[PDB]
Write a protein that binds this ligand. Structure first.
Ligand code: HEM
Ligand code: HEM
Ligand code: HEM
Ligand code: HEM
Ligand code: HEM
Ligand SMILES: C/C=C(C)/C=C/C=C/[C@H](OC)[C@@H](C)[C@@H](OC)[C@@H](C)CCc1oc2c(O)c(OC)cc(OC)c2c(=O)c1C
Ligand SMILES: C/C=C(C)/C=C/C=C/[C@H](OC)[C@@H](C)[C@@H](OC)[C@@H](C)CCc1oc2c(O)c(OC)cc(OC)c2c(=O)c1C
Ligand SMILES: CCCCCCCCO[C@@H]1[C@@H](O)[C@H](O)[C@@H](CO)O[C@H]1O
Ligand code: FES
Ligand code: FES
Ligand SMILES: [Sr+2]
Ligand SMILES: [Sr+2]
Lengths: 428, 256, 179, 428, 256, 179
């Protein structure tokens, strides 16, 4: 909504085309949008995600060209891709590790938002849509991981469909529908394939809206101070056109990211993975060392922190006449952790946008970040003492942050003064 | 169970520059053929890959001769015939002998430290070392705590972390005393059990170390391809990064 | 007058009706197909099974354990008190729906030697490890840390119930008929 | 753009949402666009296509959930769908016949355009994008038809990949790449599956642009006379808001179309099909009665009309040193027939928009339509006399229409006067 | 070759209201079982469907007893065993005997007229009639023209349009004189070759007509479900069309 | 000065280079995989084949006809003027690349009894019908109407060449080695 100059048809073809389908003008306004001068290296995860989505989609289509979604051939079919398909081994490892890169990026993308208040008015829709992508992403990655049909694939498939068979009443129905049978079997693999293919396109469409969302409000900068919109004159004092300034840092940033990424795929392709998925799915035994995918660990930690012996669970069990047992409580905790995060635009009562100028906020924020790391770390630890306590304190801190701390800091906290203008911040 | 500790072998293929040792893989293929193959199979390994670059790289006619010793049930003839290089090695003959096609990747040997996995970020997954250690780890004498409680049919192995352990070998809390456990695989390597061509030594250590590298290749035949692809990519990018870095610095200087 | 405002309703209603006739099958195609619903009832030879040995068998795509327990297993099993459990229901399809999680109420025989149950954790589905695994001489589910006693009763973790027992009965001297 | 009224946020939620993501305003302007009052039943094929695309996509995703893309299981897998999957038999027959409905509609949609000059300035982009959808549609339907892996599936697969191995020089390469081997085999089936899934989404995206295209110029009406844009006053005399007028007409039209369509699927599901595809693909024999899918017949007719003994082929052959032989000439004729059609905006030199007011034009137009029918009809006839002559005269008339007749009528022709305004036509 | 003409049988299932005749299909299943099955198979037909509504609808225990006769190589046990209703009928025992699972859908009997297919728009595809006509069309005497030139191993059949025909039976232009051609299937139906249960007549005509209907079901088991679904849908829509037509008329009247 | 305008090219160039290194493999994955390329060389028993009988055999995923011709087939074959053929090349991988479409140049034996060729129409791939079909006493391709004579030579239709003959030779009294 900043003050600028729109596309002006100059060429001959350009004037012909423009009067019929102003598609060139649209592309123009999308990459000629005035962007704040002070953006830092935390604003480059959006485009790393773009890349990731595109990378996954094309490598996916390619991979789907050699993959057979049927329990008798799926695992064999992926080895075929590793051993026979020209550059298959590389295409596989790229789709795989591509997933990890996709998540490393969202978390950074997300936490960037949490710290700078990019989710605060008028950016709530950008934020909500974002959350939808996140769920879609997770669902997608989940189904994809099942396709190889290795051990981690099968049991992961079992445990996740199982989550729905924990919903009181309708539960076993929903679960039998997801499985198309009494167990995880071909019918399950076959429909996951179809959905794994379909979801990325939904994410893509959502991303379109996501983009549209922030172009409508303008991007938030590290100072939380809006761009001046009283005259192109001062508006330009706070901004610089997206092209070529940000298009270039993006490509630069992408090259550095891809450098590390390719180093990973080239030299340590199986680090971020689980050795057990190189073992064909066995429906009669679950690997003693089964473990969710690292990007799923934090939420998996929250889920199994809640066993029968936990008080809050017991209170709930008793208070609901036994409906909310440990099983269902863990499930509600996990999705609740995500849902709570989606509600932050409303749980956060401080009127100050950037956490840069919030003294108390900062401590809780970093505790949150540390907590996220800790949760991911416990996810891989056993359930014995003291991991059970650590996972518990951690889960507790998570909800405490969105439900209690942020709402309270809204009043308690006495914030520092932010720059008067982006221009002023950029110069200083 | 848990993830234990394995003997750290300095295989040729480790490191961003490591590559297979053609003759080693050749020796390994022989160990596998005359020893393991009796119980283990490699169903995802097409025999004809014994010829492809980056591996044992045997001459096509040898490979063709090799596939001979296998009886395969045709896929149309319904009958049996001699193995063609287009055939995959057979399935494990011994029902409970796992498939070795991907074994070197199916195992990790560098677990930890503290679940942080920082140990692999430097040590890799240790699949080959793991396999090595299992062939190594067959002590002549059963660890003390098991003295008279050895599950018949099994054998104590120092590297194995997923076998049963006599109750008389666990501690107050149920954990095991032993470093290893009981595996259903009887010791497979006896000294000079394989008659190498070039005379090379067939000490249990050597054979074990060779067959391991073979299996590492059998699981990652495109290892070298991957690393070359990797090195190439890192290069474009290092260069491209620098240019873009300068292009960006130049472009932005007109602002700051 | 209201012939048109009725028309709207008759229309809108006809629409919604169709809209649903369309949707239901899109949803219903995912329910078990005719080849899956073909649930049978296998038989298992046990003549081989020495005591202290578990037998895993496929059935309906999930495993079913058949362990011949030791004195010790039967011992610990019986020494537990209905009030010491997490789930008092016997979860036995053979006996009464309301029976109790007593060690006799969990085996097929009276000597309490034949424990037959679904090797499907009641938490989220994984297959608990046997061979006296866990902190209650039974099974341990590696997925989220549930422990089961020598009778397959849940004693700790997030699992809410005891491993179910299916319709299982001895067809003769040495053969159990599952299903 | 016609003078209409902007969206206006009234609700409480509506004002909140609108200031953040004006998505509601967009949807508004899309279905609140002033449309000419005189549109006739020939303008309802656009929405029948919309429906068809949606129908195919959802039935496709569903079907992909039970289908195994591997020569050993694909055919068996589709019978499984017919015999086991709840309502599978119906879902299959619906995707199948859905294809036929998709084409019956484009042809009517296309011919509507040819007659009313809906492709004439400023609607060239709408037209070109349309042509792209058409190619995409054909490619999609082609790959889909291969999936069952029946006799017609296999040989159809052979003959069509073969078309590319007729390109001089690069030909055998392109063809080997499309097949991933020396013949049509699993590698081919497997990649067709992936592409069949992917293409519909491309069509969808193109359709988005297609729509955007005519909303930019306004829809053409049966009189070729534009809507008045000098004042909302008279603009409304020529138009009526899209909602509820055309939204309703559309649903009404859709109900009637679907009525016939369902009658087809319910009672004669296999009429528009080929009995041979109920026979498993045999790579060692081609059914004596093999025959393209009816919607492919007209172009197939043009291709095999050109044998060695056709003098223009003989001329062309010689005048090009044996490069352009019969084989490659037929191929060029077929794609040329389509390409020529795409060029009509430029081959048509008459300044009069609607063919309603073009006396000579009509005769040639109806001959074109009859020719299309005739071509479809010969496609199913043998190659013996007189079908060889009929296919030939027909093909000749096709190119004669776009290349010679239309350019010439631009000058020769003496056109009737069209209504002064849409209002005037609507009333009269 | 070409598409010929077949005997027009008035099967119960034809017409938007037609439906299978449960007992007929039952008889048909018997003809197929005691006659055809000797050479032909039905690989896509799950035996258990003999029980599903809309077909023969035999009682599950009968069907279970039936599957008994077949020998099936158990997919796990790898061992042979009896047939379970979950098994499909076996593959054709006779190499060149086509599979009959879809035959009634993989054949047209009403070809034309003039490639316009207007003949089917009213006559259907004629798959069952076609099959009927082939079982019918085995004449005792070979058409004149072939007197002493009958390809050994074949039989003249008046409905078959894809068999070989002796040179001595073609015309100046190569076309065949005969209405039919030589098929490799020896006549299969002899009078009262199947001792029907309810006594019903087992005349070659009858058996042939029954087994045809069976095969029509074996190919379109969901024939009735589809038609009901069809009828239902046509109904909603006819009604819905009328309402919308009136709603549209009403709505537009305010314009013209 | 021009260090930056050079920078642009060093950059733009580096980009385009990568962009291609990326694209080529996306394209190349679709080329025959390592398992396909395993081209062998079968053998066929012919001892059975009476004259006037065609034998269809699979090889490289397409058919290969092996017809033992009759006197008639060999006559019509020989009574043909190279000037009347649509393709004069023998299309025989056994003999010289430039040989001519003469009947003798199309059979394996001299008596002109063994015709061996790919049953793959040269137009677009279908399998032409044998048993002396078509106007020229040979094969007829139902896909677009190509006719071939008793030597498998194209005499009419859109097919541009004669059915190819692969490396085929008699390994003995009664066995041809294709491939
Ligand atoms: C049992 C009454 C029976 C039926 C029914 C039946 C049908 C049948 C059809 C429809 C065909 C297909 C012909 C075509 O391609 O259009 C067919 C073909 C063959 N049959 Fe048959 N057949 C029945 C019984 C038997 C029996 C008992 C045998 C074996 C003695 C047999 C054999 C064959 C063979 C061989 C063919 C294919 C040869 C050919 O000419 O195509 N049939 N049959
Ligand atoms: C498909 C993954 C996603 C992609 C491709 C994507 C892309 C982008 C891009 C390009 C930007 C602008 C550049 C930047 O600031 O990095 C952006 C901004 C933003 N994204 Fe995302 N995003 C994704 C997921 C998410 C998720 C999961 C959230 C968290 C719910 C989120 C929240 C935001 C927010 C709050 C902004 C700030 C917008 C503003 O400043 O007005 N995004 N995103
Ligand atoms: C939203 C972006 C996507 C994500 C996050 C994603 C994630 C994943 C993951 C985690 C796997 C398992 C990888 C492994 O085997 O280690 C996978 C596999 C697969 N994905 Fe995707 N995927 C994405 C998009 C796609 C798309 C668009 C397709 C469409 C064809 C696709 C097709 C496949 C196929 C065929 C496999 C199986 C082969 C394999 O194991 O790699 N993916 N995906
Ligand atoms: C997915 C297939 C397609 C869909 C869904 C589609 C949809 C539509 C719709 C909704 C309209 C407006 C209503 C109407 O006049 O029918 C339209 C207009 C039009 N379409 Fe398409 N169309 C498709 C394919 C094509 C093709 C293949 C062509 C042929 C090039 C084409 C040419 C046109 C033209 C000339 C117009 C008139 C534009 C105007 O009045 O400004 N369309 N289409
Ligand atoms: C652009 C709209 C589409 C068209 C025109 C189309 C057309 C076709 C056709 C002609 C067939 C063969 C039908 C037959 O067996 O007789 C087919 C099959 C199939 N299509 Fe599509 N399709 C479309 C979209 C889709 C989509 C989006 C998917 C996947 C999401 C899909 C999945 C399938 C599958 C799995 C089959 C094989 C099963 C079958 O034989 O029906 N289709 N399609
Ligand atoms: C047809 C579409 C379907 C079925 C969509 C389902 C979507 C579900 C959710 O997506 C929103 C879900 C993926 C998301 O929950 C928010 C994740 C954080 C779940 C985290 C997750 O992972 C596991 C895993 O990966 C495993 O592998 C071996 C094993 C597991 O137990 C041992 C887990 C597990 O215990 C949990 C909680
Ligand atoms: C991987 C993606 C690929 C390879 C996409 C390719 C797309 C190609 C074209 O779409 C643009 C193509 C479908 C389109 O040409 C304009 C059609 C009119 C071709 C018409 C067509 O059909 C046949 C057919 O169906 C057959 O069996 C039922 C058999 C056939 O001969 C015997 C034909 C045939 O002779 C022709 C010309
Ligand atoms: C920022 C990330 C940099 C990554 C550099 C990775 C160098 C990896 O080098 C790896 C070893 O770590 C691994 O143990 C062996 C196993 O064979 O393979 C090598 O390529
Ligand atoms: S599934 Fe067993 S503990 Fe969770
Ligand atoms: S492919 Fe044989 S005539 Fe066209
Ligand atoms: Sr090492
Ligand atoms: Sr009839």
């Amino acid at each position: 909504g900043i003050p600028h100059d729109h596309y002006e048809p100059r060429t001959g073809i350009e004037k012909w085309l423009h009067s019929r389908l102003p598609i060139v003008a649209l592309a123009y306004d999308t990459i000629m949008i005035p962007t704040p001068r002070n953006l830092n290296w935390m604003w480059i995860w959006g485009v790393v995600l773009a890349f990731c989505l595109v990378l996954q989609i094309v490598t996916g289509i390619v991979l789907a060209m050699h993959y057979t979604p049927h329990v008798d051939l799926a695992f064999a079919s992926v080895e075929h891709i590793m051993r026979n398909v020209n550059g298959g081994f590389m295409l596989r490892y790229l789709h795989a590790n591509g997933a990890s890169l996709f998540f490393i990026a969202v978390y950074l993308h997300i936490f960037r938002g949490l710290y700078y208040g990019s989710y605060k008015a008028p950016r709530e829709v950008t934020w909500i849509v974002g959350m939808l992508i996140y769920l879609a992403m997770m669902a997608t990655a989940f189904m994809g991981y099942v396709l190889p049909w290795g051990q981690m694939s099968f049991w992961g498939a079992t445990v996740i469909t199982g989550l729905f068979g924990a919903i009181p009443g309708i539960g076993h129905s929903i679960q039998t529908w997801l499985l198309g049978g009494p167990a995880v079997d071909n019918a399950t693999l076959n429909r996951f394939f179809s959905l794994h293919y379909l979801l990325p396109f939904v994410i893509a469409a959502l991303v379109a809206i996501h983009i549209w969302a922030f172009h409508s409000t303008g991007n938030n900068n590290p100072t939380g101070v809006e761009v001046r919109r009283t005259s192109k004159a001062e508006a330009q004092k706070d901004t610089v056109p997206f092209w070529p300034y940000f298009i270039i840092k993006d490509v630069f940033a992408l090259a550095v990211v891809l450098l590390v990424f390719f180093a990973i795929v080239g030299f340590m392709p199986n680090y971020l993975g689980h050795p057990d998925n190189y073992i064909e799915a066995n429906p009669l035994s679950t690997p003693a060392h089964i473990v969710p995918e690292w990007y799923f660990l934090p939420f998996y930690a929250i889920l199994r922190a809640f066993t029968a012996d936990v008080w809050v669970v017991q209170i709930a069990n008793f208070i609901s006449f036994g409906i909310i047992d440990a099983k269902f409580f863990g499930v509600l905790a996990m999705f609740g952790a995500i849902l709570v995060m989606a509600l932050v635009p409303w749980l956060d009562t401080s009127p100050v946008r950037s956490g840069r100028y919030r003294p108390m906020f900062k401590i809780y924020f970093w505790l949150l970040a540390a907590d996220f790391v800790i949760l991911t770390w416990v996810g891989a630890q056993q359930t014995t003492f003291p991991y059970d306590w650590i996972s518990l304190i951690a889960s507790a801190y998570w909800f405490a942050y969105f439900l209690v701390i942020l709402p309270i800091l809204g009043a308690i906290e006495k914030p520092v003064a932010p720059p008067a203008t982006i221009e002023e911040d950029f110069n200083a | 169970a848990g993830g234990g500790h394995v003997e750290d072998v300095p295989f040729s293929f480790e490191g961003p520059f490591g590559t297979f040792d053609q003759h080693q893989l050749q020796r390994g293929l022989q160990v596998y053929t005359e020893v393991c193959a009796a119980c283990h199979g490699m169903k995802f390994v097409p025999i004809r890959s014994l010829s492809e670059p980056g591996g044992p790289e045997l001459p096509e006619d040898q490979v063709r001769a090799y596939a001979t010793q296998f009886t395969v049930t045709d896929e149309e003839t319904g009958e049996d015939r001699e193995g063609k290089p287009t055939d995959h090695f057979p399935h494990s003959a011994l029902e409970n002998a796992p498939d070795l096609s991907l074994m070197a990747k199916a195992r990790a040997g560098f677990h930890g430290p503290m679940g942080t996995g920082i140990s692999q970020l430097f040590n890799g997954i240790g699949g080959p070392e793991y396999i090595y250690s299992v062939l190594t780890g067959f002590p002549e004498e059963p660890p003390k705590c098991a003295e008279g409680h050895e599950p018949d049919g099994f054998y104590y192995n120092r590297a194995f972390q997923n076998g049963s352990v006599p109750d008389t070998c666990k501690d107050a809390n149920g954990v095991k005393t032993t470093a290893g456990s009981w595996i259903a695989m009887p010791p497979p390597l006896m000294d000079d059990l394989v008659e190498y061509a070039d005379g090379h030594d067939a000490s249990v250590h050597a054979m074990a170390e060779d067959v391991s590298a073979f299996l590492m290749w059998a699981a990652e035949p495109k290892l070298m391809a991957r690393k070359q692809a990797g090195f190439t990519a890192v290069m474009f990018l290092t260069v491209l990064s620098v240019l873009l870095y300068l292009t960006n610095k130049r472009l932005w200087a007109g602002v700051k | 007058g209201t012939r048109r405002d009725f028309l709207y309703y008759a229309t809108a209603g006809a629409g919604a009706v169709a809209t649903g006739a369309a949707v239901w099958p899109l949803i219903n195609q995912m329910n078990p197909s005719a080849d899956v619903q073909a649930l049978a009832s296998i038989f298992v030879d046990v003549s081989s099974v020495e005591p202290g040995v578990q037998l895993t068998v496929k059935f309906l795509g999930k495993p079913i354990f058949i362990r011949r327990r030791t004195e010790a297993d039967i011992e610990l099993g019986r020494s537990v008190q209905l009030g010491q459990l997490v789930d008092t229901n016997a979860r036995n399809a053979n006996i009464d729906a309301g029976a109790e999680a007593t060690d006799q109420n969990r085996t097929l025989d009276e000597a309490g030697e034949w424990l037959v149950m679904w090797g499907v954790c009641t938490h989220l589905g994984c297959v608990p490890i046997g061979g006296v695994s866990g902190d209650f001489g039974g099974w341990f589910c590696p997925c989220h840390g549930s422990h089961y006693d020598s009778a397959g009763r849940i004693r700790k973790g997030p699992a809410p119930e005891n491993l179910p027992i299916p319709l299982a009965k001895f067809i003769d001297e040495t053969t159990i008929q599952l299903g």
